[PDB]
Amino acid sequence: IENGWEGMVDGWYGFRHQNSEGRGQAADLKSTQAAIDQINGKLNRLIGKTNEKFHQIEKEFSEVEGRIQDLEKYVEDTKIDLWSYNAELLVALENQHTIDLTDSEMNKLFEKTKKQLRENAEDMGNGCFKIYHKCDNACIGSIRNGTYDHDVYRDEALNNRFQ
Amino acid sequence: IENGWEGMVDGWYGFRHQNSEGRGQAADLKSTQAAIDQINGKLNRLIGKTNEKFHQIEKEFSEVEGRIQDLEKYVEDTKIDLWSYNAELLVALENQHTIDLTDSEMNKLFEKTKKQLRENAEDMGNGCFKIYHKCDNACIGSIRNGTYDHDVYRDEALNNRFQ
Amino acid sequence: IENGWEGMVDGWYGFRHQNSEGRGQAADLKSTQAAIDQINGKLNRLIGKTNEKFHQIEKEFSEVEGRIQDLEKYVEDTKIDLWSYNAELLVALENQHTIDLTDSEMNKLFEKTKKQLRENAEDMGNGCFKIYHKCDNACIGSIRNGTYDHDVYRDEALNNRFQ
Amino acid sequence: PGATLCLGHHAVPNGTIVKTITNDQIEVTNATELVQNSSIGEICDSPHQILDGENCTLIDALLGDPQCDGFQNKKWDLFVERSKAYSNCYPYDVPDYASLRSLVA
Amino acid sequence: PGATLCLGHHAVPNGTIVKTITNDQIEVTNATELVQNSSIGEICDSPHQILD
Amino acid sequence: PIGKCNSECITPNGSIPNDKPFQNVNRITYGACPRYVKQSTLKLATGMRNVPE
Amino acid sequence: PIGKCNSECITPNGSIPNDKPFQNVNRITYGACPRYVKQSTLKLATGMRNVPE
Amino acid sequence: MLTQPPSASGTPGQRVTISCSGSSSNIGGNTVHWFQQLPGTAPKLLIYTNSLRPSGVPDRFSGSKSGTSASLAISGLQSEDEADYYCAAWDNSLNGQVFGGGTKLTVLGQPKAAPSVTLFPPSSEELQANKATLVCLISDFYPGAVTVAWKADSSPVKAGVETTTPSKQSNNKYAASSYLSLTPEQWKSHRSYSCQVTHEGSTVEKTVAPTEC
Amino acid sequence: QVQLLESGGGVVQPGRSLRLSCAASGFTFSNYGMHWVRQAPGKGLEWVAIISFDGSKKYYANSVKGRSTISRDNSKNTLSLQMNSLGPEDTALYYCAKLPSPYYFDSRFVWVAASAFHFWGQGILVTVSSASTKGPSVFPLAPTAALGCLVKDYFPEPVTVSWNSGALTSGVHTFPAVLQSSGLYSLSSVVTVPSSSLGTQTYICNVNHKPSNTKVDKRVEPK
Ligand SMILES: *[C@@H]1O[C@H](CO)[C@@H](O[C@@H]2O[C@H](CO)[C@@H](O)[C@H](O)[C@H]2NC(C)=O)[C@H](O)[C@H]1NC(C)=O
Ligand SMILES: *[C@@H]1O[C@H](CO)[C@@H](O[C@@H]2O[C@H](CO)[C@@H](O)[C@H](O)[C@H]2NC(C)=O)[C@H](O)[C@H]1NC(C)=O
Ligand SMILES: *[C@@H]1O[C@H](CO)[C@@H](O[C@@H]2O[C@H](CO)[C@@H](O)[C@H](O)[C@H]2NC(C)=O)[C@H](O)[C@H]1NC(C)=O
């Protein structure tokens, strides 16, 4: 893909088509629904899960005591550093996974389409196909809904594609 | 793929074929061997590697002592929480990796096949191919073993595929 | 791919071609530049980032004191074990990511090429293409630079590919 | 003759920067903060039972410093010691002061 | 005329549920417990020397 | 100051919300509190890569 | 009770096997013991995703 | 419709599981969710997106889904979990929301099952209105299966109506109450009424009886 | 949490129409698609309709398609349902509820959240049957011990029973109603009380029947 589409407001992934009937755009429900489900599960894991701790050691001192003070400071500092490391690593990993799952859903949709147009189209390489037959808005709908039959348009597209 | 095949007992990934000689099923040794090797390496990493610890602090108290008791409880609790976090994260990561490697082996096998049938077949999109020539059980064997030559069947399949 | 190419010294990924003008080899700048950028960012994250710690507890003892000594040993040992676990896991994860990004860049380049030769070539399956027209060194350059137009060579390659 | 069909995803004019393994800084559509760093400035009396012992320490209320007679026989969940607290009775000291304070708390 | 060829993987009627990053609960063929939670109830006299 | 509200996490700076997994207000906590970390901000992505148009 | 067996990990509940990396029997351990965690069960996948037929 | 078995069962702390089978139109393509309906009250949401619990829900309830089969597991089942459990999912063919049949799960009732039987006669204002209804009830018994033999002066009748109330939240005690109702015509013509319990919690059927006094 | 005032329940003759409306407060109603679900007495849970957060998408069940309409007003924060040509298979409770649904039914602002906003309203009871809803008749039932109140010969079903101004709260068993050959309902409400309180503190039940303006009190004890 080259960039994104700012005009999409009823979904996250979609299709743009230019045929003899004009130019149109429409989003895909299933892919964006799956992405939303995964991110909501991620948030449900992270947010709202905090355990209780009531009585602990002291962590601020107004006096000079020596050994025990040194040990308590060391313990709290070690705990803090380890938990901060864990937090930074968890955030990095979860964000990488979010990016990966979104890109995977985009590629899933692209492949689902490409396999539907078996020989009636070619991959131009810019995230856009070239369909080699007269395909109207109803034909585009048959594509996206999953009802497109290649046999109907197969011979015409093979002709316009090899001669 | 749509689902799995419960009849497979001599492997994990395989092929099903329907030709004029009937319907048959046979598993692939290399891919399942690689998956088994990876999972066995995972188990060899995890299982049986425990280090020794003999003398430690006390972790249960029948008396009320104050400062040192508070500190020892805090230390053990912090250690326990950090190790539990590590355990949950490690299990999640290793299981994700197991799933990913198994799916990757399936896709590896699918692509290995698809590249072998260069133009003599089409990808129907349901994890099944359509081979456009009369292919007998010996021809299927030549496919799976890796000895299938497309040139022999190329012209017939190109004919039955474009006319 | 079968193996690597030891003769490459001006890059990491590249092309080898055999045409009527002979055999040649030349590397791809963009892909190796991206890989180098990612590994340099990884090193910039890891190397040179160490925080200061000045006054801590004692960690070696020449006497036999009992409770406090036991606690200090326990604390330092717990810290050491947790940090060693973190170090081993971080190194494993970062190396896996390095391998993954390098392989991804190789596959990115392969696909970028494959989409450029839309119908004028076939995927032999051994990390090498078969181009079905007389392609000179200037034509190979037009391929790699990104200026290759399939239309110019489309009809000749379709002929030599289907008849 | 023939039509074209494009596959794409959405975007927004003002994304936010986050961090991953590949990129130290990368822009996404929307993101949430996971580090609570703001507070109101006051302590909430619920759901935990709070005892604002404002001019008194826990030890003073324990012994019975006359300004602390309010805290006689009272229970609590969190005792709030103020920086204005001071003792006004007979001068004293407690060996293992912290330990008695902790066990009483 | 032409034959079809399918690629697939195996399955089992009774898998077990595990946890990953994508899915809190997902079913796999087989899995092993990593948390020893059962004990016999007695202390073994070997290999460590015990003094009751 | 003691107020009249509801929060299950108390710090010497006041009560704080207990939804985010981490916090850096203070390390001294009472209740169902998020863990103290040194980072001032950790942001979690709730959307895909954003290349505008 | 003291028995007559062999195990390199001893807890106040008895000896336990030292193969699994974790355990939650008890936190008081002697020997080559698995680390105490709070989870009652952590399962490791030894097979692919299972979509039955 | 979605396929849920009518009944589930177990012992306190047994981790019961309910299943839900569907079709490619709803579950194979969309996520499922699970609601809990305590007897006599509105349903409450337990699970959504096949594994997610909302704020209120304890982690004892878990969910899963594969292909056309969803599962709802309860780990630490206890006294206060006897209720109805509904699986539901969105269907794209019908373009709507399709629910499950419903599943009733019961707990292992320690078969104490001592019906505190009590026969109740009709009162004055009932008979002044030319009405009569003699009642016989059983409290704190188990299980739901039971029978009642009427004795209208040692004679059986037809069309006797009673209702079984669901389990109690704490004590897990069932209860039934059957009342026979007529007018003073067939009422003052016979004098001894009796009810005989036939239950799996005692030796043989047990009769209790009032007389016209 | 969620404060909804529901309205429209009652008795409606066969072939006629019902019109329910529940008004919500406590959240941004403007960005949540809503559902109407129904539950026949006995058992069962059938879904009726769904409406988007802006009306742009409505969908009904094949069982009530072509004779029902779901509607909403974001100004008065009101959800409403209209159904015509009612038959006995439609007597049921109707819940106005926010269920989990496809993402496009709710707004853009609530697509991603860790909360999953949800609520079910209390039932709205509608009953299709012949008219003349008659009030109740309450009789005391008196003889380890047991006593109670039997309330018979009423319709509709909406009935509630309390004990001694809501005092007796334990051991109480209110039995679910049963319908008969006639359009009459019955309801037994018993309690196991010790044999040591025949005169300690005698008990009196109260029965609230709303769709008759009825609050009947009656005391129970033997002679
Ligand atoms: C983008 O993410 C932000 C979080 O940073 C969301 O802003 C929060 O929105 C919820 C509900 O709308 C409020 O309760 C919070 O107070 C908001 N926080 C902040 C810092 O604004 C925002 O809603 C998200 N946008 C979208 C379209 O999902
Ligand atoms: C806590 O102590 C302060 C100071 O001892 C009290 O403030 C005093 O209030 C009284 C009457 O309210 C005045 O006579 C004093 O002049 C105040 N102190 C000063 C320094 O001006 C305060 O009232 C005490 N509060 C409690 C709850 O004990
Ligand atoms: C599936 O995994 C389980 C582990 O949960 C295996 O069961 C163990 O099998 C080994 C050897 O067969 C025994 O020593 C263990 O006692 C078993 N444990 C349990 C809990 O049963 C099982 O063998 C695996 N199945 C397959 C086909 O590999």
CA dist C116 to A124, A127, B29, C152, Å?
Answer: 8, 13, 36, 13
Q: Measured on CA atoms in the order H179, H184, H186, H188, is the torsion positive or negative?
A: positive
Cβ neighbours of D100 (radius 10 Å): 16
Q: Are G24 and E35 a contacting pair at CB < 8 A?
A: yes
Q: How far is the CA of B36 from the centre of ligand 3 (A)?
A: 15
How many degrees, rounded to 5, is the angle at CA A84 between CA A80 and CA A88?
175
Chains G and E touch (3+ CB pairs under 8 A): yes
CA I21 to chain centroid: 14
Rg of chain C over Cα atoms, rounded to whole angstroms, equals 28
**Coil/strand/helix, residue F50:** coil
CA dist C88 to C81, C82, C84, C92, C94, Å?
Answer: 11, 10, 6, 6, 10
Nearest CA to ligand 3 atom 22: E30
Query: What is the C-alpha separation between I174 and I190, in angstroms, rounded?
Result: 6
Chain I residues within an 8 Å CB radius of A11: 104
How many degrees, rounded to 5, is the angle at CA I33 between CA I30 and CA I35?
130
Cβ neighbours of F12 (radius 10 Å): 15
DSSP state of G20: S
Residues H127 and H153 in one domain: yes
Of the CATH numbers 2.60.40.10, 1.10.10.60, 3.40.50.2020, 3.60.15.10, which one belongs to the domain with range I3-128?
Answer: 2.60.40.10
Sequence-separated (6 or more) residues with CB below 8 Å from residue D35: A87, F20, F22, F23, F24, F37, F39, F40, F41, F42
Sequence-separated (6 or more) residues with CB below 8 Å from residue A42: A94, A97, A98, F44
Sequence-separated (6 or more) residues with CB below 8 Å from residue A112: B125
Q: Of the candidates H106, H138, H167, which is a domain's last residue?
A: H106
* Overall fold of domain A14-160: Hemagglutinin Ectodomain; Chain B (3.90.20)
Cβ neighbours of F42 (radius 10 Å): 23
Reading the block at residue A118, the tokens are 């078996």
CB of G53 within 8 Å of a chain B CB? The answer is yes
| Cβ pair G41, G34 in contact under 8 A | no
Report helix, strand and coil shares of chain D as percent, to nearest 5. Answer: 20, 30, 55
| DSSP assignment of chain I | --EEEEE--EE--TTS-EEEEEEEESS-GGG--EEEEEE-SSS--EEEEEE-TTSS-EEE-TTTTTSEEEEEETTTTEEEEEE-S--GGG-EEEEEEE----GGGS-STTSS-SS---EEPPPEEEE-S-S-----EEEEE----EEEEEEEEE-SS--EEEETTTT--SSEEEPPPEE-SSS-EEEEEEEE--TT-SSSS-EEEEEEEGGGTEEEEEEE---
Nearest CA to H195 out of H174, H213, H179 is that of H179
Return the amino acid letter for H33. H
Report helix, strand and coil shares of chain E as percent, to nearest 5. Answer: 0, 45, 55
Structural element, H or E, at residue A142: helix A137-145
* Domain extent at residue H47: 7-106
| Cβ pair D36, F33 in contact under 8 A | no
Cβ–ligand 2 contact at D52 (below 6 Å): no
Nearest CA to I206 out of I194, I221, I189 is that of I189
Supply φ then ψ for residue F36, to 5 degrees. -70, 130
Nearest CA to B56 out of A149, I200, C73 is that of C73
- The verdict on residue H124 lying in a domain is yes
For position H13, which CATH number holds?
2.60.40.10
Q: Of the candidates H54, H86, H106, which is a domain's last residue?
A: H106
CA of D71, nearest ligand number: 2
**Coil/strand/helix, residue H194:** strand
The label of the residue with tokens 């070997």 reads E46
I149 forms beta bridges with I140, I189
What b-and-e string marks burial along I186-222, b requiring 16 or more CB atoms within 10 Å of the CB?
A: bbbbbbbbeeeeeeeeebbbbbebebbeeebebebee
Nearest CA to H133 out of I39, B84, I153, B119 is that of I153
DSSP state of H151: E
Of the CATH numbers 3.40.50.720, 2.60.40.10, 3.50.50.60, 3.30.110.60, which one belongs to the domain with range I137-220?
Answer: 2.60.40.10
How many degrees, rounded to 5, is the angle at CA C133 between CA C127 and CA C137?
75
Nearest CA to D11 out of A10, I112, A12, A128 is that of A12
H165 forms beta bridges with H175
Nearest CA to ligand 3 atom 26: E30
DSSP state of H199: -
CA A28 to chain centroid: 13
Residues H26 and H90 in one domain: yes
Q: How far is the CA of E29 from the centre of ligand 3 (A)?
A: 12
In sequence order, what E strands does chain H have?
Answer: 7-9, 16-21, 32-37, 44-48, 61-66, 69-74, 84-91, 96-99, 103-106, 118-120, 132-141, 147-152, 162-165, 174-182, 193-198, 206-208
CB of B122 within 8 Å of a chain A CB? The answer is yes
Chain H residues within an 8 Å CB radius of G51: 66-67
Give the start-to-end residue ranges of the domains of chain I: 3-128, 137-220
Nearest CA to A33 out of A84, A86, A92, A108 is that of A108
Q: Are B119 and C123 a contacting pair at CB < 8 A?
A: no
CB of D22 within 8 Å of a chain F CB? The answer is no
Query: What is the C-alpha separation between C59 and A70, in angstroms, rounded?
Result: 12
- The verdict on residue H54 lying in a domain is yes
CA dist B60 to A75, D9, G9, G34, H71, Å?
Answer: 19, 58, 19, 19, 41
Residues H81 and H126 in one domain: no
I137 forms beta bridges with I152
Query: What is the C-alpha separation between H186 and H134, in angstroms, rounded?
Result: 13
Q: Are C41 and D21 a contacting pair at CB < 8 A?
A: no
Nearest CA to ligand 1 atom 28: I109
Residues H11 and H100 in one domain: yes
Q: What's the reported resolution, in angstroms, to a tenth?
A: 3.2
Chain A residues within an 8 Å CB radius of E21: 93-94, 97
The label of the residue with tokens 């008890």 reads G26
Cβ–ligand 3 contact at E37 (below 6 Å): no
Residues H96 and H129 in one domain: no
Query: What is the C-alpha separation between H100 and C74, in angstroms, rounded?
Result: 56
Sequence-separated (6 or more) residues with CB below 8 Å from residue C150: C116, C117, C118, C119, C120
Cβ neighbours of C139 (radius 10 Å): 17
**Coil/strand/helix, residue A65:** coil
Residues H37 and H102 in one domain: yes
Query: What is the C-alpha separation between B152 and B73, in angstroms, rounded?
Result: 77
Q: Which of F9, F49, F53 to mutate to test the interface with D (most CBs of D within 10 A)?
A: F49
Q: Which of B84, B95, B109 to mutate to test the interface with G (most CBs of G within 10 A)?
A: B84
CA I52 to chain centroid: 25
Nearest CA to H168 out of H209, H208, H139 is that of H139
How many degrees, rounded to 5, is the angle at CA H77 between CA H74 and CA H79?
145
> Determined by which method?
X-ray
Nearest CA to B35 out of B16, B14, B49 is that of B14
Residues H14 and H97 in one domain: yes
Query: What is the C-alpha separation between D5 and A24, in angstroms, rounded?
Result: 10
Residues in chain E: 52
The partner residue sitting opposite A125, judged by closest CB among C57, C115, C158, is C115
Q: How far is the CA of B4 from the centre of ligand 3 (A)?
A: 22
Q: How far is the CA of E30 from the centre of ligand 3 (A)?
A: 9
Supply φ then ψ for residue C79, to 5 degrees. -55, -50
Fold matches, I3-128 and I137-220: yes
Return the amino acid letter for C31. S
Q: Are A102 and F46 a contacting pair at CB < 8 A?
A: no
Chains E and B touch (3+ CB pairs under 8 A): yes
CA of D37, nearest ligand number: 1
| Cβ pair G35, G23 in contact under 8 A | yes
Cβ–ligand 3 contact at E30 (below 6 Å): yes
Nearest CA to A148 out of A118, A126, A116, A124 is that of A116
CB of D21 within 8 Å of a chain B CB? The answer is no
| Cβ pair G18, G34 in contact under 8 A | yes
Cβ–ligand 3 contact at E20 (below 6 Å): no
Task: Count helices and strands (H / E) in chain C.
Answer: 4, 4
Query: What is the C-alpha separation between H175 and E37, in angstroms, rounded?
Result: 41
Chain D residues within an 8 Å CB radius of C38: 22
Q: Measured on CA atoms in the order G27, G33, G35, G39, is the torsion positive or negative?
A: negative
Nearest CA to B71 out of A56, A59, A77, A63 is that of A56
